[PDB]
Structure formats: C-alpha cells, structure tokens
C-alpha cells in the first residue's frame, strides 16, 4: 500500500481485440505514459498505437496527441472510450 489510490474508468479498445475493455487509469496519466500503459493493453507500442476519445454513442472528439498533457484536460470523463488504434499492426511475424 501506498499515498495515492484514484483515477477514472474509461472503456479501452483495439481494432485487434472485437470488444472494450475495462480499465482505469489516474487523469494524472500523461498521454504518453498513459499509452505506455495501453501497450500492456494492446500489447503493442504505444509509440505507435494511437489513442481516440470517443463520446457517448461512439462519437469521435478530439485526439490524445499532446503527450505533454494530461489525462484529464480533454473532454473526456470516467465513462467515455479510449479506442486504441493498433498501428504496429502484427500479424504472420511475432505471432
């Protein structure tokens, strides 16, 4: 155990996995370090994935490219949907 224990629910995804998944990451995450995480996620580079804020009904917003930033100061909130985009891509090689 430790100081510090919060964050916010967002439904990460992949062209690679068929359906979200659930994950939480702190709105302290920066982009880039957020990514580091997704790479878990999708297993693939997060110097490659790219990362998607989708509204409500699937509705694209803006895009987490500032990795000097943090996860938060967009308009998004525990509930919306990470959609990450595999560009590694894998396929025949690796697997």
């Known amino acids: 155990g430790s ?9 990460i995804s992949s062209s690679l996995n068929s359906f979200r998944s659930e994950k939480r990451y702190s ?7 957020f ?6 996620v999708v297993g693939s580079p997060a110097s490659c994935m790219e990362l998607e804020l989708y509204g409500a009904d699937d509705k694209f917003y803006s895009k987490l490219d500032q990795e000097d930033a943090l996860l938060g100061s967009y308009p998004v909130d ?17 697997g």
């Open 27 to 33: 709105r302290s995450l920066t982009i880039a370090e």
């Open 78 to 94: 525990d509930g919306c949907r990470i959609h990450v985009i595999d560009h590694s891509g894998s396929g025949p090689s690796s």
């Open 3 to 11: 100081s510090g224990s919060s964050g916010v629910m967002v439904f």
């Open 35 to 40: 990514k580091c995480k997704l790479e878990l």
